[PDB]
Symmetry: C3
Subunit: 128 residues, 3 copies
C-alpha cells in the first residue's frame, strides 16, 4: 500500500534573494519522508512521484518555483515551473530519491507574494 505525503503552507519565509515555504502535513501514510520547516528530508530510498503547485500574487516580470534535491552537498534541480495578479504554476515528475536527501521548493525572487491557502499552494509525494 503506497506511502504518500501531501504538504500545505503554514508560513512564507525569505539577504538570500529567495523565498521558501514552511510546510505542514495534511495527509501522511507510511513514513520515509519528513517535512522539517521549509524542507522535506528523505529517509527511505526509492522512486517517488513529486508534485508542486505554487499560487503566485506578485505583479513581477517573471516568476516560478524550483524543486531541487541536495545529497552529498551538491544540489540538482529536479524540475521547475515558470510563468510570465493571481496565477498558479503546476509541475511534477518521477525521481530517484536517496536517504539523506533534502528536498526544497524555492522561488528565486526575494519576498515573493504567494498564497498560503492549502488548495492553491502545495507539495506532495507518492512512493512508487
Amino acid at each position: 500500500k503506497h506511502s504518500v505525503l501531501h504538504l500545505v503552507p503554514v508560513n512564507i519565509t525569505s539577504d538570500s534573494d529567495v523565498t521558501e515555504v514552511m510546510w505542514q502535513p495534511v495527509l501522511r501514510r507510511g513514513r520515509g519522508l519528513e517535512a522539517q520547516g521549509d524542507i522535506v528530508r528523505v529517509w527511505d530510498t526509492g522512486i517517488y512521484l513529486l508534485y508542486s503547485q505554487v499560487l503566485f500574487h506578485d505583479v513581477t516580470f517573471t516568476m516560478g518555483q524550483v524543486v531541487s534535491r541536495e545529497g552529498q552537498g551538491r544540489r540538482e534541480t529536479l524540475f521547475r515551473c515558470i510563468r510570465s495578479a493571481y496565477n498558479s504554476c503546476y509541475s511534477a515528475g518521477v525521481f530517484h530519491l536517496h536517504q539523506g536527501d533534502i528536498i526544497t521548493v524555492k522561488i528565486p525572487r526575494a519576498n515573493a507574494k504567494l498564497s498560503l491557502s492549502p488548495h492553491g499552494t502545495f507539495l506532495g509525494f507518492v512512493k512508487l
Copy 2:
C-alpha cells in the same frame, strides 16, 4: 492492480453563477468511483491521485477550475487552478476520499466557454 478512472466532457452546464461539466468515462478499471453527470460519487474509501485539466476559451479577466469534495454536507476545496483566447489550466494532488463523498469540478463564472474536447478538458483518478 490499480483502479483508475479517466473522464471526458459530454456537455457544459450552468442563476447559480457557476459552470460545470457533465463527465463520461473513456478509461475505467476497478469500480469504487462513478460519474453521475456533473459529479463523481466516491464509493470505495481510499487515497486517490486526482487530476483535472480545463481548456478555457473566454476573454475574461480571471478564471480557473475548483475541485472540491462534499461529505456530510460541508464542502472542502481540495485544489484549484487559476490563470489571468485558448488556455489550459492543469492541477492535481493526492487526497483521502471517503465513501459517500461527492467530487465536483466547478468554474466560479457563469456560462464559461470551455473546450468539450477530450484532450483539452478531462478529470481523472488513480486509487493508491
Copy 3:
C-alpha cells in the same frame, strides 16, 4: 514494483510545420517502454500515467504541446497543453497503451524555441 521512465531532451528537431524532441532516459525501471529518438515505443500493454512538460521561449501568439499515440496507423491525441519569453506548459493523464503503439510529443509550429534543460522540458511514464 512500478515500471517508470523519465525522459529529458538531447536535441530539438523540426517542411512538416512541426517541432519534436529527441528524448534520453535519466530514470528507468522495468522495460516495457523504449525511447527511440523523437518517439517512445510501447512494448508492454498496460495502463500508464503519462506526463509532459515543455518550457517554451518563443514570442509567438499561441503555442503548446500535443501528446498522441498511433497504433494501427490511425493517430489519437491523448492530451494537450496550451498557453497564449519563458513559460512552461504542464499536462498529464492516465491512458491505456498497447504494444506496438508509438508515443509522440509534437508542437504544431515549425522551428519552435524550447528549452533543452532537463528540469524545464521532460516526458515521463508510470505503469499502473
